[PDB]
Structures are given as structure tokens and as C-alpha cells.
Design a protein around this motif. Structure first.
Motif, PDB file in Angstrom:
ATOM      1  N   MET A 201       0.975  -1.406  -0.113  1.00 10.82           N
ATOM      2  CA  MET A 201       0.060   0.149  -0.251  1.00 10.82           C
ATOM      3  C   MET A 201       0.353   1.445  -0.056  1.00 10.82           C
ATOM      4  O   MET A 201       0.540   2.316  -0.453  1.00 10.82           O
ATOM      5  CB  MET A 201      -1.012  -0.073   1.381  1.00 10.82           C
ATOM      6  CG  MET A 201      -0.455   0.285   2.939  1.00 10.82           C
ATOM      7  SD  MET A 201       0.224   1.207   3.108  1.00 10.82           S
ATOM      8  CE  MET A 201      -0.893   2.060   3.089  1.00 10.82           C
ATOM      9  N   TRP A 205      -0.881   3.431  -3.238  1.00 10.94           N
ATOM     10  CA  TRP A 205      -1.444   4.322  -2.685  1.00 10.94           C
ATOM     11  C   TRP A 205      -1.690   5.915  -3.599  1.00 10.94           C
ATOM     12  O   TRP A 205      -2.931   5.943  -3.869  1.00 10.94           O
ATOM     13  CB  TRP A 205      -1.264   4.737  -1.356  1.00 10.94           C
ATOM     14  CG  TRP A 205      -2.573   5.019  -0.570  1.00 10.94           C
ATOM     15  CD1 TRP A 205      -4.249   4.429  -0.720  1.00 10.94           C
ATOM     16  CD2 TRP A 205      -3.652   6.408  -0.321  1.00 10.94           C
ATOM     17  NE1 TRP A 205      -4.907   5.500  -0.023  1.00 10.94           N
ATOM     18  CE2 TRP A 205      -3.948   6.917   0.209  1.00 10.94           C
ATOM     19  CE3 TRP A 205      -1.895   7.759  -0.534  1.00 10.94           C
ATOM     20  CZ2 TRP A 205      -4.658   8.001   0.646  1.00 10.94           C
ATOM     21  CZ3 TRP A 205      -2.147   8.707  -0.026  1.00 10.94           C
ATOM     22  CH2 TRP A 205      -3.998   9.242   0.231  1.00 10.94           C
ATOM     23  N   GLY A 208      -3.273   4.920  -6.661  1.00  9.81           N
ATOM     24  CA  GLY A 208      -4.649   4.668  -5.948  1.00  9.81           C
ATOM     25  C   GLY A 208      -5.653   5.897  -7.496  1.00  9.81           C
ATOM     26  O   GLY A 208      -4.766   6.630  -7.366  1.00  9.81           O
ATOM     27  N   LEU A 223      -5.745   1.113  -4.343  1.00 10.29           N
ATOM     28  CA  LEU A 223      -6.326   1.325  -3.446  1.00 10.29           C
ATOM     29  C   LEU A 223      -6.308   2.179  -3.019  1.00 10.29           C
ATOM     30  O   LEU A 223      -5.750   3.509  -2.745  1.00 10.29           O
ATOM     31  CB  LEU A 223      -5.053   0.819  -3.281  1.00 10.29           C
ATOM     32  CG  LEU A 223      -4.438   0.456  -1.599  1.00 10.29           C
ATOM     33  CD1 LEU A 223      -3.042  -0.673  -2.061  1.00 10.29           C
ATOM     34  CD2 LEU A 223      -3.819   2.093  -1.223  1.00 10.29           C
ATOM     35  N   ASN A 224      -7.633   2.421  -2.281  1.00  9.32           N
ATOM     36  CA  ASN A 224      -8.003   3.327  -1.704  1.00  9.32           C
ATOM     37  C   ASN A 224      -8.247   4.044  -0.711  1.00  9.32           C
ATOM     38  O   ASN A 224      -7.094   3.512   0.486  1.00  9.32           O
ATOM     39  CB  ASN A 224      -9.329   3.775  -2.078  1.00  9.32           C
ATOM     40  CG  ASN A 224     -10.087   3.181  -3.352  1.00  9.32           C
ATOM     41  OD1 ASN A 224     -10.741   1.606  -3.307  1.00  9.32           O
ATOM     42  ND2 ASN A 224     -10.800   3.304  -4.342  1.00  9.32           N
ATOM     43  N   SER A 225      -8.430   5.312  -0.081  1.00 16.13           N
ATOM     44  CA  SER A 225      -8.257   5.461   1.365  1.00 16.13           C
ATOM     45  C   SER A 225      -9.123   4.758   1.886  1.00 16.13           C
ATOM     46  O   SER A 225      -8.723   4.982   3.170  1.00 16.13           O
ATOM     47  CB  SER A 225      -8.565   7.282   1.265  1.00 16.13           C
ATOM     48  OG  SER A 225      -8.084   7.893   2.006  1.00 16.13           O
ATOM     49  N   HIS A 227      -8.975   2.037   2.007  1.00 11.70           N
ATOM     50  CA  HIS A 227      -8.013   0.487   1.719  1.00 11.70           C
ATOM     51  C   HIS A 227      -7.434   1.265   3.050  1.00 11.70           C
ATOM     52  O   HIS A 227      -7.239   0.323   4.303  1.00 11.70           O
ATOM     53  CB  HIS A 227      -7.489   0.136   0.750  1.00 11.70           C
ATOM     54  CG  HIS A 227      -9.271  -0.142  -0.332  1.00 11.70           C
ATOM     55  ND1 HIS A 227      -8.471  -1.034  -1.297  1.00 11.70           N
ATOM     56  CD2 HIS A 227     -10.116  -0.690  -0.942  1.00 11.70           C
ATOM     57  CE1 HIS A 227      -9.310  -1.445  -2.379  1.00 11.70           C
ATOM     58  NE2 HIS A 227     -10.435  -1.330  -1.817  1.00 11.70           N
ATOM     59  N   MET A 228      -6.522   2.268   2.749  1.00 13.05           N
ATOM     60  CA  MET A 228      -5.457   2.184   3.571  1.00 13.05           C
ATOM     61  C   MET A 228      -6.364   2.215   5.455  1.00 13.05           C
ATOM     62  O   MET A 228      -5.463   2.779   6.489  1.00 13.05           O
ATOM     63  CB  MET A 228      -4.885   3.198   3.486  1.00 13.05           C
ATOM     64  CG  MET A 228      -5.492   5.417   2.915  1.00 13.05           C
ATOM     65  SD  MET A 228      -5.981   5.832   4.776  1.00 13.05           S
ATOM     66  CE  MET A 228      -4.089   6.089   4.891  1.00 13.05           C
ATOM     67  N   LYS A 264       0.902   8.093   6.033  1.00 13.56           N
ATOM     68  CA  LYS A 264      -0.269   9.143   5.341  1.00 13.56           C
ATOM     69  C   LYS A 264      -1.202   9.332   6.134  1.00 13.56           C
ATOM     70  O   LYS A 264      -2.139   9.965   5.640  1.00 13.56           O
ATOM     71  CB  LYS A 264      -0.797   7.577   4.557  1.00 13.56           C
ATOM     72  CG  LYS A 264      -0.226   7.766   2.801  1.00 13.56           C
ATOM     73  CD  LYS A 264       1.437   7.531   3.273  1.00 13.56           C
ATOM     74  CE  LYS A 264       1.660   5.334   3.705  1.00 13.56           C
ATOM     75  NZ  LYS A 264       2.504   4.706   3.611  1.00 13.56           N
TER      76      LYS A 264
END
Length: 292
Positions: A201, A205, A208, A223-225, A227-228, A264
Motif C-alpha cells: 500500500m 496508494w 490509486g 487501492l483507496n484511502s 483501503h488504507m 499517510k
């Protein structure tokens, strides 16, 4: 190394030297695979194990952080080097999910090697569904005929047979976090799985489509926010569930791994789930454990 210039203008002798180096490293890793799977009883096998764990895995992992932080993955790892790296994924995943008292001693270096390679890896092996957008895909570049001509599984699901995708790894992580069992019960996940998707990630990211609204949802990895956010939730849940159980240095390594990850995190969205980390880490501060 200078993968950018090497790929843009480089002599075929050194080119093939590097490709042969990578292929030989993957070959040595594969032969070590089969003979530790069939070699429970022990020495040339011990010699090659020492070779691997002392030189091969560490210097390859170092090249992996090099490729990741110099961003040299955009030039070097393009054609058939990434299928060698697919084989390396199979090898290192077999190591990570492998259950062996013989390898239990050096699983620690295995975790950092997996983390480095997942950070340096240019193919969304975790986003099997959306890998059609990835221009780096050997399926897109090699084409079907050369794929069948070479040793390709011809399927995006079969490019990593026992390696799970991001969604099923995520459900495994949330299920084990919900279970909340002792660390020694199932350590392999904590010291292998977590660093891989953390580095994955941390690389993908900003790849993304949310980060670049143009070319979105046909960009190469979704790979979305959220997802994080989900992986932050996983981090908090496992760390809280395993604060009590005997902890260890391997979490300090995981926290170092999550240090680029928490970068992040906005320092204001930091609070209300790191403020709980604040209090349950500094009322429990009489330990060698340190974060942030």
C-alpha cells in the motif's frame, strides 16, 4: 544502481548479465523451495540454506528497497524479469506460509525480505480483478502467444496460485483480529503478511486513482484511502489484541514498517484511534516497546 539510464541506454552484455543474475537467484530460491519441502530431515542443503539466508535474501531485499525508494521499478522490472519476480513471489510466499521449526530461526529475515520485495514489486498481485489496466502486466506486454510459448499460467488468478488476493487477505486479517488469539498460535501472519501489504500500500496508494482523478478507474490499481483506513483498523486491532500476549521485537519491526504507513495519516485524524494508542502505550510505557 541506475536502472533508469541502464534501461534507456545500456549494452546488451551487462543487460543479459543482470537478467541472468535475477534468473539464477530465482532458480536458487526455487530449488531451495523443493528441497526444504521434501528435506525435513537434514550438508550441501545446509550450505545452500546458509548461502540463501546470509547473502541471497538480504542483498536481494536491499536491491528491493533500492528499487522502491529510487523508484527504479518504472524502468528495470518490465519484461520477463517480472515473471522471474512472479516465481520469487511464489518462493517467498511459500516461505511465509511454510510451517517449519527449521526455518523458524530465520523467519525474521524472511519478513523484511517479503516487505522489501512487495515494496519494490510493480504488479498488482493483490488486485487480480483490475490487473487489466496494469501496463506492467506480463499478460498485457508478453501477449497470449508468447505467454503460452513461455511458462506463464495464462490466468491472472493463476499467476499466483497459493498467493491470495488483497480482498481475501483482508478478510483473513479481520477474521484473525476478531478471533484475537495468542501470538504464538499463528505468528506467521503477523511477521510475514503484515509487512507485505504494508509496503504494497505504501507503494500503490498514490497509484490509486483517487490520487490522480484523471485516468481514474482505468488506472492500474484501486487501492483507496478507505483501503488504507481499513489497514489502519487492522493495525490497531491486532496490536491491541496482542499487547497482552508476550509481545516482542517483531512488533517493533512492524511499527517501523508502519512508520511510513502512519505518515499517510493526517496528524488530526491521528487522534481518537492513536489517542487510544497514546494512552494504552504510555500507561504501558514500562516496556522496551517504542512507537512513533
Amino acid at each position: 544502481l541506475d536502472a533508469r539510464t541502464v534501461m534507456k541506454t545500456g549494452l546488451e552484455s551487462v543487460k543479459s548479465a543482470l537478467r541472468a543474475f535475477l534468473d539464477n537467484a530465482a532458480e536458487d530460491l526455487e530449488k531451495t523451495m523443493e528441497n526444504l519441502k521434501q528435506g525435513q530431515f537434514t550438508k550441501g542443503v545446509t550450505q545452500i540454506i546458509n548461502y540463501t539466508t546470509v547473502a541471497l535474501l538480504p542483498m536481494l531485499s536491499s536491491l528491493f528497497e533500492h528499487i522502491g525508494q529510487h523508484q527504479f521499478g518504472e524502468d528495470l522490472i518490465l519484461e520477463d524479469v517480472q515473471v522471474s519476480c512472479y516465481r520469487i513471489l511464489t518462493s517467498l510466499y511459500a516461505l511465509g506460509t511454510s510451517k517449519s521449526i527449521y526455518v523458524e530461526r530465520q523467519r525474521s529475515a524472511l519478513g523484511e525480505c517479503l516487505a522489501a520485495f512487495a515494496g519494490a514489486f510493480p504488479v498488482a498481485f493483490l488486485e487480480t480483478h483490475l490487473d487489466k489496466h496494469n501496463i506492467y502486466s506480463i499478460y498485457n506486454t508478453k501477449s497470449s502467444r508468447e505467454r503460452a510459448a513461455l511458462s506463464l499460467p495464462t490466468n491472472v488468478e493463476d499467476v499466483c496460485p497459493n498467493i491470495p488476493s488483497l480482498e481475501k487477505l483482508m478478510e483473513e486479517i479481520v477474521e484473525l483480529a476478531e478471533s484475537g488469539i495468542r501470538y504464538t498460535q499463528m505468528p506467521h501472519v503477523m511477521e510475514v503478511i503484515l509487512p507485505m501489504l504494508c509496503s504494497y500500500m505504501s507503494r500503490w496508494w498514490e497509484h490509486g486513482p483517487e490520487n490522480n482523478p484523471e485516468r481514474a478507474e482505468m488506472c492500474c490499481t484501486a487501492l483507496n484511502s478507505e483501503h488504507m483506513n481499513t489497514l489502519l483498523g487492522n493495525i490497531l486491532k491486532i496490536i491491541y489484541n496482542n499487547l497482552g500476549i508476550d509481545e516482542g521485537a517483531w512488533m517493533k519491526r512492524l511499527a517501523v514498517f508502519s512508520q511510513p504507513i502512519i505518515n499517510k495519516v493526517k496528524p488530526q485524524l491521528l487522534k481518537t484511534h492513536f489517542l487510544p494508542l497514546m494512552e494504552k502505550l504510555k500507561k504501558k510505557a514500562a516496556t522496551v516497546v517504542s512507537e512513533e
